[PDB]
Design a protein around this ligand. Structure first.
Ligand SMILES: CCCCCCCCCCCCCCCCCC(=O)OC[C@H](COP(=O)([O-])OCC[N+](C)(C)C)OC(=O)CCCCCCCCCCCCCCCCC
Ligand SMILES: CCCCCCCCCCCCCCCCCC(=O)OC[C@H](COP(=O)([O-])OCC[N+](C)(C)C)OC(=O)CCCCCCCCCCCCCCCCC
Ligand SMILES: CCCCCCCCCCCCCCCCCC(=O)OC[C@H](COP(=O)(O)OCCN)OC(=O)CCCCCCCCCCCCCCCCC
Ligand SMILES: CCCCCCCCCCCCCCCCCC(=O)OC[C@H](COP(=O)(O)OCCN)OC(=O)CCCCCCCCCCCCCCCCC
Ligand SMILES: CCCCCCCCCCCCCCCCCC(=O)OC[C@H](COP(=O)(O)OCCN)OC(=O)CCCCCCCCCCCCCCCCC
Ligand SMILES: CCCCCCCCCCCCCCCCCC(=O)OC[C@H](COP(=O)(O)OCCN)OC(=O)CCCCCCCCCCCCCCCCC
Ligand code: SF4
Lengths: 165, 157, 93, 98, 82, 105, 39, 306, 70
């Protein structure tokens, strides 16, 4: 259960590798959805559920909905991408193995897998979950709040102006 | 007989019971007979109570009720819709037009019976036959597909 | 571990259902859909901004939080009013 | 955490290399762009949660919102390309050479 | 007159926008009117999510109490009587 | 920054959440708050070059707290030596490290 | 400088410058509708 | 014991789904002056089982041009999202207690609209793709209005938990403070479940049965969610069976209300549905969202964190 | 008549009685006649771990009162 986060990170790397290998855009969006779910799982494993549910509710929830929608109004095989994907995953296994043995405990350590996921946590305490600071954006970072709001308002104006035709 | 054939017969009973209890038609409805079809759908006779669901898509259909006059302009459409329907499919022709041309038998633009286009399981006679009689035809179809022994034939292969 | 077990059981049940379902029998683009899709993107990110309000309601400086939330929902209303006035909400040639 | 952060940086590098090596699909290019965006979100969120930086957990929300509006702009541009050329092929976009 | 007629026949033909705009205006104005607006901030301040760290006194300050069961300090009798 | 409108008007639009030891919601201290505070207290008022030259001890302590590279090296060395003594068999784990100990609150 | 690898180019223009749905309504069934749609 | 609890949650939900199909047939028949199925079984109780067995027994007409990957993925995804939607629900105690269960619910609905979009793109027909785009736009717009409505009513509640909602509801129903929100939430759940008058309506046998199962499961879940949020059942710490029974009764009335609405009303137009949402709900939703932002501030009724 | 639908109502009502009641009963059985203690915060999780360490059988629900104090 200590290799859970590393397995998730490897799955994210595999999904990003396939997305870079660029299949048909529907399958590319499917791989991006899988990578988004995996990134949600990593964020939930590392900490508060709020940022993970932003990934799972806003990134997965809306953004790739609109990617899939826009791909659906678009149009497009050759099956080579699966061949480079299996070649890439066996090369990835070989590369993480050779990096694991060669750097001793550097970026990758076999014995250190799962030992350094949670560094320090406040065992006794309320007000520690991930949504509290993002809510403090309403109070502490009003400049963040207003630049995000102005970004969305200007984005509305931009989008209708571009698609006005 | 052998114990395996008893289990095969019971499996045939279960499958045939499922297929006759859940009989979803699309009515390839043309005419007078399609009006009488929806009078069978009407609350008096209640094929929905019988397990027969009104207004199903041809992709979800089990039996095609050929209701009306099949013309030469409509016969390719009939054959195409029959081909789109999945493999466990039956055909109930209803009315003299779909049976043998009927009152337009000697017409230049009328197919003399829909059996020239699609294989008809059961013919319902009348012009129009009553909704009572069409429901008779549907129950006769349920009895007919109850009589099927597919795993028995496969075991005796 | 519990949620992992339940999601695995859910996926396994659905997969075995589709497996028994198989084993048992033996262009003309429209601009307006893209418009409502991007309008959903903008409103959904504005939801992402609005979502931490159950924890932002507990702050000491309730006036500043209230002012920011009021301004934000006001610019939601203003953007929707813009799109309504410039006919991005109807389906008409 | 260092192994998973290294994996995230290699995921970003792979997505960047996929962005830099174009194929026929501008949709695939935009998908690689959001591969980079998603990798950035996970690295920022894991860094904030590891450092317990509650003041800077709004930064993932801001990168998500800003990159999503940027990709909405890019999707609108791809819609314009698909409308003018029938398809979204990037080799149709080449008459500004002269 | 004309403005009153405009709101009147607007309420006649479509009340959705009228109700939404009136609810908007009420949400603007009612925090500026009700006397309970400050009490939300007072309650949020009084809610003790963190440990109150004791202070090492030199005896020059008499306002801080030595005991929690003392008359000195910010009591919440207003909260009990709210 | 390139322009100092925030410093001229005295406002703090984005200067109050620059680092980990800044203002935090409900006084929740970030990791290495003391180390970063020590580094900033050393480095303030002497410039970047003198901060790099003179506050190197404080910066190295803060970086070691933030990254735990030497901690990972030490723990990996301990675990590798313990695994070697497992392999040659001249050492046994104690009851408290084997999961059988009397718990304390 | 018209070379062999660039002589095919043309100068830019001075000013820098209906696909519709042909639906077949039908078996909802003795009606055929060739229906011409703009969205 | 946990796997036993998993089984005794999921299996009765599927039984409720099948008998929801049966009771829809019976209620629609009796509202149309006829009967439901009663021949198949003693009183029709074997009719959903016969329907499911026929649907799994009929061969699936699988076109070769359709992508087998998406054709596999869409119905299995839709069913597993219906069950994952069901798991974090307290009745009054859940199988799994999530900190942000309502966010989990909404994002699972987002994955469901992935499922319908993937099914529509896999169905190789231009009319099917057009109807798929229309259905995704419908589901998406009613999802954004659900998210804003639910955000405001939990601004009244206090957190994204559901036991916090039970503690909120233990004195009165949330229908009285948030009844226009309740009406818009009910309409939004209707248009998520694609029930009449918002149905606006490809797959044969197996996948069709899976989609039918998941849609009816989502219908029961939208009813249960509306019950838990807006109409609080009676909760007592010494007995939870009263809460379970009362939640049961209100969920059955809300399911009957969906079947009631389908019987009573003709379906909407696509332009009329988008017009209704984007011109009547979302203005009211935003106005009431800011009103429910303002309400605890000027009433000092800010809810606790727990 | 209209009461013929009440068989289906009874089946659905029963099979929504099973999930919540069964969940509560299984929680009480697995935690010793008490509700499943929820840890929404690190403080509550720390309390659970403290009870698990005090109880001496590696189960948190075995609560110890004054019998452990002389
Ligand atoms: C949980 C909800 C869903 C429940 C679903 C039902 C569950 C219980 C099912 C019990 C029976 C299981 C096996 C039934 C398969 C019968 C198929 C059949 O008769 O097909 C005819 C055909 C007959 O084959 P055939 O040899 O005549 O060739 C068919 C091709 N023609 C006719 C054109 C030459 O197939 C079989 O009999 C194969 C049966 C395989 C059974 C595997 C188990
Ligand atoms: C949660 C428990 C269950 C609740 C629901 C129970 C079942 C009810 C079922 C009814 C049938 C529904 C079937 C589908 C119908 C679809 C059509 C439909 O509903 O259209 C909506 C219709 C649409 O109206 P329309 O179609 O006429 O269009 C309006 C636009 N014009 C006229 C220009 C064309 O109504 C609405 O959109 C209104 C929604 C309700 C708003 C209620 C506001 C009340 C007041 C607000 C607060 C004000 C005071 C604030 C505080 C002040 C304090 C001092
Ligand atoms: C800050 C401002 C926003 C506050 C929050 C509320 C958000 C509301 C967003 C939408 C309202 C702004 C845009 C209005 C608009 O464009 O109206 C167009 C409408 C006619 O267009 P049409 O689409 O036909 O409308 C019928 C609806 N199907 O036109 C009309 O129907 C005319 C309406 C005229 C009256 C408007 C309401 C006045 C209320 C005064 C209250 C005073 C107290
Ligand atoms: C590193 C830089 C070089 C990478 C080379 C990858 C293979 C290649 O040359 O791909 C070219 C291809 C061009 O795009 P395309 O539309 O397919 O063009 C048709 C071809 N005339 O490009 C593409 O289709 C995009 C390919 C993106 C691949 C992303 C993942 C790469 C993973 C492997 C990295 C390199 C490994 C090298 C190993 C060498 C042996 C040990
Ligand atoms: C056919 C292909 C289908 C592909 C898509 C599959 C979708 C499945 C259905 C939707 C599942 C959604 C899961 C979303 C993530 C969990 C959300 C959440 O809130 O997680 C946090 C929660 C604990 O957080 P909290 O509530 O704060 O608790 C602490 C307080 N006591 O809980 C946790 O921390 C638990 C962490 C894990 C939770 C997710 C488990 C996923 C299991 C793997 C699924 C894929 C398996 C591999 C592929 C199988 C074949 C397809
Ligand atoms: C579905 C499954 C099958 C049905 C399950 C439920 C069966 C319930 C049967 C018993 C219903 C008893 C209703 C009250 C009877 C006594 C009475 O006085 O009735 C008359 C009264 C109206 O009398 P009146 O004076 O004209 O009204 C003025 C304003 N009320 O009438 C009333 O006040 C009526 C009050 C109740 C209204 C709702 C009744 C139905 C509830 C379930 C709806 C299911 C929809 C599907
Ligand atoms: S058989 Fe008679 S009733 Fe039926 S379609 Fe022909 S003319 Fe009409």
């Amino acid at each position: 259960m200590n290799n859970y986060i590393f397995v998730l990170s490897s799955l994210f790397l595999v999904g990003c590798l396939g997305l870079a290998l660029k299949p048909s855009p529907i399958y590319g969006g499917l791989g991006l959805i899988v990578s988004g779910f995996v990134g949600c799982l990593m964020v939930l494993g590392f900490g508060g559920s709020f940022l993970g549910l932003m990934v799972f509710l806003i990134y997965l929830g809306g953004m790739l909905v609109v990617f899939g929608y826009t791909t659906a109004m678009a149009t497009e095989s050759n099956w080579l991408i699966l061949g480079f994907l299996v070649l890439g995953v066996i090369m990835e296994v070989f590369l993480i193995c050779v990096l694991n043995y060669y750097d001793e405990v550097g970026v990758i350590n076999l014995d250190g897998l799962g030992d350094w996921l949670m560094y320090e946590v406040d065992d006794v305490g309320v007000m520690l979950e991930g949504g509290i600071g993002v809510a403090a954006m309403y109070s502490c970072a009003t400049w963040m709040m207003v630049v995000a709001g102005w970004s969305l308002f200007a984005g509305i104006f931009i989008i209708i102006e571009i698609t006005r035709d | 007989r052998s114990r395996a054939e008893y289990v095969v017969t019971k499996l045939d009973d279960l499958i045939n019971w499922a297929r006759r209890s859940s009989l979803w038609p699309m009515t390839f409805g043309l005419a007078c007979c399609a009006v009488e079809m929806m009078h069978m759908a009407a609350p008096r006779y209640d094929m929905d109570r019988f397990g027969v669901v009104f207004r199903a898509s041809p992709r979800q259909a089990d039996v095609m009720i050929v209701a009306g006059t099949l013309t030469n302009k409509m016969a390719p459409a009939l054959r195409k819709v029959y081909d789109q329907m999945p493999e466990p499919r039956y055909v109930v022709s209803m009315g003299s037009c779909a049976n043998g041309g009927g009152y337009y038998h000697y017409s230049y633009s009328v197919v003399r019976g829909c059996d020239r286009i699609v294989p008809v399981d059961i013919y319902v006679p009348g012009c129009p036959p009553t909704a009572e009689a069409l429901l008779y035809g549907i129950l006769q179809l349920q009895r007919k597909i109850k009589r099927e022994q597919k795993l028995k034939i496969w075991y005796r292969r | 571990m519990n949620l992992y077990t339940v999601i695995f059981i859910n996926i396994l049940l659905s997969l075995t259902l589709i497996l028994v379902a198989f084993w048992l029998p033996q262009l003309p683009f429209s601009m307006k859909f893209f418009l409502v899709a991007i309008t959903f993107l903008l409103f959904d990110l504005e939801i992402a901004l609005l979502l931490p309000l159950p924890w932002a309601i507990q702050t000491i400086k309730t006036s500043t939080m209230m002012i920011m939330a009021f301004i934000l929902v006001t610019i939601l209303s203003l953007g929707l009013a813009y799109e309504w006035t410039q006919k991005g909400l109807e389906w008409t040639e | 955490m260092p192994s998973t952060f290294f994996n995230l940086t290699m995921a970003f590098s792979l997505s960047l290399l996929g962005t830099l090596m174009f194929r026929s699909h501008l949709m695939s290019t935009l998908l690689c762009l959001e591969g980079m965006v998603l990798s950035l979100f996970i690295m920022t969120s894991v860094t904030s949660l590891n450092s317990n930086s509650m003041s800077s957990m709004p930064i993932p929300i801001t990168i998500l919102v800003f990159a999503a509006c940027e990709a909405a702009v890019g999707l609108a541009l791809l819609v314009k390309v698909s409308n003018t050329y029938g398809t979204d092929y990037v080799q149709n976009l080449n008459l500004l050479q002269c | 007159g004309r403005i009153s007629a405009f709101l009147k026949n607007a309420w006649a033909k479509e009340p959705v926008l009228v109700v939404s705009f009136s609810v908007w205006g009420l949400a603007i104005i009612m925090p500026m009117i009700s006397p309970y607006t400050k009490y939300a901030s007072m309650i949020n301040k009084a809610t003790p999510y963190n440990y109150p760290v004791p202070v090492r006194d030199d005896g020059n300050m008499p306002d801080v109490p030595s005991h929690p069961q003392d008359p000195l300090g910010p009591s919440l009798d207003w909260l009990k009587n709210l | 920054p390139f322009l100092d409108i925030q410093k001229k008007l005295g406002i703090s639009l984005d200067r109050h959440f620059m680092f980990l030891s800044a203002e935090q919601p409900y006084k929740n201290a970030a990791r290495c708050h003391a180390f970063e505070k020590e580094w900033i207290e050393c480095a303030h008022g002497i410039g970047g070059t003198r901060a790099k030259k003179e506050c190197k001890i404080e910066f190295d302590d803060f970086e070691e707290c933030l990254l735990r590279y030497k901690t990972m090296r030490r723990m990996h060395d301990i675990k590798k030596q313990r695994e070697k003594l497992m392999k040659e068999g001249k050492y046994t784990p104690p009851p408290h490290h084997s999961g059988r100990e009397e718990p304390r609150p | 400088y018209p070379s062999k690898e660039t002589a095919h180019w043309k100068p830019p223009p001075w000013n820098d410058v209906v696909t519709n749905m042909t639906l077949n309504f039908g078996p909802q069934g003795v009606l055929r509708l060739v229906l011409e749609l703009s969205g | 014991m946990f796997f036993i609890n998993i089984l005794t949650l999921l299996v009765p939900i599927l039984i409720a789904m099948a008998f929801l199909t049966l009771v829809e047939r019976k209620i629609l028949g009796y509202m149309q002056l006829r009967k439901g199925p009663n021949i198949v079984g003693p009183y029709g109780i074997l009719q959903p089982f016969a329907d499911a067995m026929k649907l799994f027994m009929k061969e699936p007409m699988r076109p070769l041009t359709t992508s087998m990957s998406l054709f596999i993925i869409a119905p299995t995804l839709s069913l597993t999202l219906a069950l994952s939607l069901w798991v974090p629900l307290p009745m009054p105690h859940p199988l799994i207690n999530l900190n942000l269960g309502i966010l989990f619910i909404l994002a699972t609905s987002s994955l469901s609209v992935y499922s319908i979009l993937w099914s529509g793109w896999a169905s190789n027909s231009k009319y099917s793709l057009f109807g798929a785009l229309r259905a995704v736009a419908q589901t998406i717009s009613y999802e954004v209005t659900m998210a804003i409505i639910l955000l405001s009513v939990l601004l009244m509640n206090g957190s994204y938990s559901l036991q916090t909602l039970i503690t909120t509801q233990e004195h009165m129903w949330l229908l009285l403070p948030a009844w226009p929100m309740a009406m818009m939430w009910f309409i939004s759940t209707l248009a998520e479940t694609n029930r009449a008058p918002f149905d606006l309506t490809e797959y044969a046998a197996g996948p069709f049965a899976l989609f039918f199962m998941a849609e009816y499961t989502n219908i029961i879940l939208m009813n249960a969610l509306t019950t838990i949020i807006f109409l609080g059942p009676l909760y007592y710490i010494n007995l939870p069976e009263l809460y379970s029974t009362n939640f049961m009764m209100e969920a059955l009335l809300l399911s009957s209300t969906f079947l009631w609405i389908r019987a009573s009303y003709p379906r909407f137009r696509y332009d009329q549905l988008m017009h209704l949402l984007w011109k009547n709900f979302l203005p009211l939703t935003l106005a009431l969202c800011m009103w429910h932002i303002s309400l605890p501030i000027f009433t000092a009724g800010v809810p606790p964190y727990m | 008549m209209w009461f013929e639908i009440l068989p289906g109502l009874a089946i659905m009502g029963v099979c929504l009685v099973i999930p919540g009641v069964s969940t509560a009963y299984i929680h009480k059985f697995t935690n010793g006649g008490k509700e499943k203690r929820v840890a929404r915060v690190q403080y509550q999780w720390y309390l659970m771990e403290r009870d698990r360490r005090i109880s001496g059988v590696n189960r948190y629900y075995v609560s110890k009162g004054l019998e452990n104090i002389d």
